[PDB]
């Protein structure tokens, strides 16, 4: 029933997926803040070239460097890495094929863009490879550079293929060093060092894709972490009252009595409008609970975040991190 | 403000194409369906090209199939018009385009190529490009006096107008023939690709370029895009109450203005009009007094104050958009208390849009 089993505290790589528009970027950022509290250092990574981190923090596009982007509670630090697939490709050519010269020539004519676009699998090898490199990097003292890596990942319809290292490597040259590092990537992804969290809204499609993605990922034996239900809203009604209101029954005499008590008397048109207003609210809560019920099928931890009433700004990120913390995320 | 009058637009048969644009997730597909249905109820012979209809909506329309081609929607016999519907099949529209330009024989090779099947048909912008292609096919066969076009979802509403030309320019890159099917630089790039990419994959890719034998793709995208400038084209931009959807609507209206393309107006979807006139502050205070002292009366008060606050946000958002675009007609569509998954719910939605 807990949202964050203790095992998720030993995870070093958190991947935040979910259907488009559910809040992967926001929640991956708040998660990074949550895990960074207490003088820890966490890296927040995005992989689609969408500069979503810079957009989230309302800053100019970030370069291909790990840079401090936020201070966490009690002296923690969140770094940002907007992975640049072109630079990552150049890095790859030079490190593993000593083809830096060719690579810099390709940058001139748009050829790196071409190669990454034409080969989907190479793209995923570079991205997942860079993620693994940030997860396992050690400092001068043989200690991990980062306490945790949080990835704003590709969405639920792509996450399974994105993490399909074997398929990615299938379309690369055989032999050489790439196949050596790919075994290490697969090991990381399948270990207790990794977890995939799925953000969803209480709407039909986000839940459907959450379920289907969980199924696909379990077949691959990839570790599921939490389902994170974003932008909840207040019911305001007790279950019995709610159920009645979703059918149109409101027992107004009681409502008229309560209003009378409150020093307010309403014209009949206004009273009818008020009665319609809470019935519609109850129909919405009931529809949401019906969709929600579909998640009860999974034996997966579930976390809940509120709706930030205005646009998500920096303070909102800290509010959401606090909610995660209060739910046991650590 | 200004009042968009979708009814008069739909009823006037000089309007032959109606394009629903906006961010994904704002109500484009259901709006497209409500508009196409209402146009049939006005007597028109309509086809709606939906891109991502909800399983249930597609069934109410009888297009839950794999066809890439319109089918009549059975409506009440009183209906003077005809509603037909289809769901874009991106991959199959790609197949049809390939055959249309390479011919059926060469097409068996292209369609059999694993690089075509696994990479080429899922490149970015395929969905917009094939939506535009399918629209082209619909126009050329002259099988309808009205085409209502749903447009694929994207965080970026301008993708519908920009991604197809972009994809065409990518397809026509010199790098296809030079790098897959010599020079110091191109020779470097070719060596790099040969050393990094799998032999099977490079063979399939060079096969694909050879077979297709195409600036073909950009020229197709340009010709098809000009169709959106024929007389009789109307764009309807759909946006929800959210700031993001509204901002995409504004971007899109701006582009439509710069290109002198006809914008019917904005559908401002999922509003929460107030049914009761009790002021917010009163609502809160009254509930708090009851809080100090039957829970039901206080809760109803909190429902109403919450809704009131939401309505305030919505009103100020629209006021922003109307301030920037005082020339753009608007219709506000309230959030309806049921899902839009049946012809009857489509009818209630169309009632909201047309009036
Ligand atoms: N709890 C919340 N309350 C209110 N607004 C929210 C909340 N979470 C996210 N948002 C807003 O929801 C919208 C979508 O969030 P975002 O974080 O961009 O989602 P996403 O999953 O990254 N979608 P994408 O990147 O397009 O695949 C943004 O405008 C956020 O600012
Ligand atoms: Mg994002």
Contacting residues of B for A174, CB less than 8 Å apart: 198-199
DSSP label of A110: T
Helix (H, G, I), strand (E, B) or coil at A109: helix
What residues are paired with A150 via a beta bridge?
Answer: A14, A44
Contacting residues of A for B177, CB less than 8 Å apart: none
How far is the alpha carbon of A160 from chain B, nearest alpha carbon, in Å? Answer: 16
Of B124, B197, B294, the CB nearest to A172: B197
Pocket mutation for ligand 1, best pick of A150, A152, A312 (most atoms within 8 Å of C-beta): A312
Contacting residues of B for A122, CB less than 8 Å apart: 196-197
**Inter-chain CB proximity A258 and B294 less than 8 Å:** yes
What DSSP letter does each residue of B222-238 carry, written as one string? HHHHHGGGSTTEEEEEE
DSSP label of B142: T
99-138 in chain B: CB under 8 A from chain A: 118-119, 122-124
Of A204, A262, A266, the CB nearest to B289: A262
B105: enclosing H helix or E strand: helix B104-112
Question: CB of B299 within 8 Å of any CB in chain A?
Answer: yes
Cβ-based neighbours of B198, under 8 Å, separated by 6 or more = A170, A171, A172, A173, A174
In order of A49, A53, A76, B62, the CA distances from A313 in angstroms are: 22, 12, 20, 44
Q: Which chain B residue has its CA at the smallest distance from A279's CA? A: B337
**Inter-chain CB proximity B299 and A111 less than 8 Å:** no
**What is the Cβ-side half-sphere exposure of residue B156, based on CA atoms within 13 angstroms?**
11
Query: By CB neighbour count within 10 A (0-12 exposed, 13-18 middle, 19+ buried), where does B92 fall?
Result: middle
Task: Find out whether B29 is annotated in a ligand binding site.
Answer: yes
CA of A230, closest atom in ligand 1: 1
- Asked if A14 contacts A225 with a C-beta cutoff of 8 angstroms, the reply is yes
Cβ-based neighbours of B256, under 8 Å, separated by 6 or more = B235, B237, B262, B263
CA of A52, closest atom in ligand 1: 25
Mutation site, B245, B274, B296, B301, interface A, largest A CB count within 10 A: B296
Q: Are strands A76-82 and B71-73 parallel, antiparallel or unpaired?
A: unpaired
A150: enclosing H helix or E strand: strand A148-152
**Inter-chain CB proximity A115 and B297 less than 8 Å:** no
**Inter-chain CB proximity A106 and B188 less than 8 Å:** yes
Residues in chain A: 330
Question: CB of B199 within 8 Å of any CB in chain A?
Answer: yes
Task: Find out whether A308 is annotated in a ligand binding site.
Answer: yes
Q: Report the C-alpha gap between B160 and B153 in whole angstroms.
A: 9
**Inter-chain CB proximity B277 and A120 less than 8 Å:** no
Contacting residues of B for A92, CB less than 8 Å apart: 196
Helices A268-293 and B295-324 pack at an angle, to 10 degrees, of 90
Question: CB of B287 within 8 Å of any CB in chain A?
Answer: yes
Q: Report the C-alpha gap between B337 and B333 in whole angstroms.
A: 12
B334: enclosing H helix or E strand: strand B330-334
Mutation site, B166, B196, B309, interface A, largest A CB count within 10 A: B196
Distance (Å) from CA A258 to ligand 1 centroid:
38
Mutation site, B157, B207, B299, B320, interface A, largest A CB count within 10 A: B299
Contacting residues of A for B294, CB less than 8 Å apart: 254, 257-258
Could you tell me the residue range of the domain that residue A120 belongs to? Answer: 1-330
Mutation site, B276, B293, B304, interface A, largest A CB count within 10 A: B276
**Inter-chain CB proximity B290 and A266 less than 8 Å:** no
Distance (Å) from CA B27 to ligand 2 centroid:
21
- Asked if B121 contacts B90 with a C-beta cutoff of 8 angstroms, the reply is yes
Q: Report the C-alpha gap between B18 and B60 in whole angstroms.
A: 22
For atom 12 of ligand 1, the residue with the nearest CA is A23
Q: What is the CATH number of domain B6-276+312-354?
A: 3.40.50.300
Q: Which chain A residue has its CA at the smallest distance from B119's CA? A: A118
Give the distance from CA A56 to its chain's centroid. 13
Q: Report the C-alpha gap between B69 and B95 in whole angstroms.
A: 13
List the beta strands (DSSP E) in B24-158: 45-50, 71-73, 82-87, 146-149
B76's tokens: 């009440």
Q: What was the resolution (in A) of this experimentally determined structure?
A: 3.1
Q: Which chain A residue has its CA at the smallest distance from B185's CA? A: A105
- Asked if A225 contacts A328 with a C-beta cutoff of 8 angstroms, the reply is no
Distance (Å) from CA A21 to ligand 1 centroid:
6
Q: Are strands B263-271 and B146-149 parallel, antiparallel or unpaired?
A: unpaired
Report how many domains make up chain A: 1
Give the CA diameter of chain B: 88
- Shortest-distance ligand to the CA of residue A47: 2
**Inter-chain CB proximity A171 and B155 less than 8 Å:** no
- Asked if B221 contacts B164 with a C-beta cutoff of 8 angstroms, the reply is yes
Q: What was the structure determination method?
A: X-ray
**What is the Cβ-side half-sphere exposure of residue A226, based on CA atoms within 13 angstroms?**
28
**CA torsion through residues A256, B305, A203, B341, sign:** positive
What DSSP letter does each residue of B288-322 carry, written as one string? HHHHH--HHHHHHHHHHHHHHHHHHHHHHHHHHHH
Using a CB cutoff of 8 Å and minimum separation of 24, what contacts does B133-141 make?
A: B133/B93, B133/B96, B133/B97, B133/B220, B133/B224, B134/B49, B134/B68, B134/B88, B134/B93, B135/B17, B135/B49, B135/B224, B135/B227, B136/B224, B136/B227, B137/B96, B138/B47, B138/B49, B138/B70, B139/B17, B139/B227
Task: Find out whether A321 is annotated in a ligand binding site.
Answer: no
Task: Find out whether B150 is annotated in a ligand binding site.
Answer: no
CB pairs under 8 A between A and B: 163
- Ligand 1 site residues (CB inside 6 A) read A 18, 20-26, 52, 155, 230-231, 305, 307-308, 311-312; B 155, 244
Q: For B149-198, give the secondary structure using H, E and C.
A: ECCCCCCCCCHHHHHHHHHHHHHCCHHHHHHCCCCHHHHHHHHHHHHHEC
């Amino acid at each position: 029933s807990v949202g964050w089993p203790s095992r998720l505290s030993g995870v070093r790589l958190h991947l935040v997926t979910g259907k488009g528009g559910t809040g992967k970027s926001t929640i991956a950022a708040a998660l990074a803040l949550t895990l960074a509290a207490g003088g820890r250092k966490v890296l927040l990574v995005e992989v689609e070239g969408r500069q979503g981190i810079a957009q989230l923090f309302d800053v100019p596009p970030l370069p291909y460097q790990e840079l401090k982007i936020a201070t966490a509670e009690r002296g923690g630090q969140v770094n940002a890495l907007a992975i640049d697939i072109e630079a990552a490709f150049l890095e790859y050519l030079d490190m593993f094929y000593n083809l830096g010269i060719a690579g810099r020539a390709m940058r001139r004519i748009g050829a790196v863009e071409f190669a990454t676009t034409i080969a989907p699998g190479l793209r995923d090898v570079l991205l997942t490879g860079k993620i693994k490199e940030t997860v396992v990097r050690l400092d001068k003292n043989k200690l991990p550079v980062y306490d945790a890596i949080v990835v704003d990942a590709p969405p639920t319809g792509r996450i399974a293929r994105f993490l399909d290292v074997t398929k990615a490597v299938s379309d690369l040259a055989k032999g050489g060093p790439v196949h050596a590092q790919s075994e290490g990537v697969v090991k990381l992804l399948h270990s207790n060092q990794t977890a995939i969290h799925l953000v969803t809204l209480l709407e039909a499609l986000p839940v459907q894709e959450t379920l289907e993605a969980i199924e696909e990922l379990a077949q691959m034996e990839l570790p599921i972490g939490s389902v994170i239900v974003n932008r909840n809203i207040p019911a305001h009604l007790e279950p019995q009252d709610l159920a009645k209101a979703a059918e149109g029954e409101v027992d107004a005499d009681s409502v008229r009595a309560g209003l009378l008590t409150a020093g307010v008397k309403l014209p009949d048109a206004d009273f009818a409008g008020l009665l319609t207003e809470t019935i519609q609210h109850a129909t919405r809560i009931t529809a949401r609970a019906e969709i929600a019920q579909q998640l009860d099928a999974l034996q997966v931890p579930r976390l809940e975040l509120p709706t930030v009433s205005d646009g998500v700004d920096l303070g909102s990120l800290y509010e959401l991190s606090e909610s995660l913390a209060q739910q046991g995320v650590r | 403000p200004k009042t968009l009058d979708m009814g008069a637009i739909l009823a006037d048969t000089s309007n032959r194409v109606v394009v629903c644009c906006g961010a994904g997730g704002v109500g484009k597909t259901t709006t497209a369906a409500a508009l196409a249905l209402r146009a049939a109820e006005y007597g028109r012979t309509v086809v709606v090209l939906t891109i991502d209809p909800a399983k249930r909506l597609a069934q109410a329309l009888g297009i839950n199939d794999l066809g890439n081609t319109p089918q009549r929607v059975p409506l009440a016999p009183e209906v003077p018009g005809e509603l037909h519907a289809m769901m874009l099949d991106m991959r199959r529209t790609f197949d049809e385009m390939v055959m249309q330009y390479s011919g059926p024989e060469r097409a068996q090779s292209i369609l059999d190529n694993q690089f075509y099947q696994t990479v080429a048909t899922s490149l970015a912008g395929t969905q917009e490009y094939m939506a535009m292609e399918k629209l082209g096919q619909l126009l050329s066969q002259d099988r309808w006096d009205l085409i209502v076009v749903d447009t694929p979802p994207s965080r970026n509403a301008l993708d519908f107008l920009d991604a197809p030309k972009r994809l065409g320019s990518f397809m026509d890159s010199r790098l296809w023939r030079l790098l897959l099917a010599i020079t110091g630089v191109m020779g470097l790039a070719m060596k790099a690709l040969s050393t990094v990419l799998g032999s099977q994959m490079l063979a399939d890719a060079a096969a694909f370029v050879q077979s297709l034998d195409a600036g073909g793709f950009r020229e197709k995208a340009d010709r098809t895009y000009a169709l959106l400038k024929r007389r009789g084209t109307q764009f309807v931009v759909v946006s929800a109450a959210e700031p993001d959807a509204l901002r995409e609507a504004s971007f899109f209206v701006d582009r439509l203005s710069q290109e002198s393309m006809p914008l019917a107006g904005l559908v401002f979807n999922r509003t929460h009009p107030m049914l009761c006139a009790l002021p917010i502050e009163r609502a809160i205070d009254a509930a708090e007094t009851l809080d100090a002292e039957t829970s039901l009366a206080a809760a109803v008060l909190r429902i109403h104050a919450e809704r009131g606050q939401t309505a305030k946000r919505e009103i100020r958002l629209l006021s922003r958009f109307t301030g920037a675009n005082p020339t753009v007609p608007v219709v506000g569509v309230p959030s309806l208390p049921f899902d839009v998954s049946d012809l009857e719910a489509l009818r209630a939605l169309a009632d909201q849009l047309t009036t």
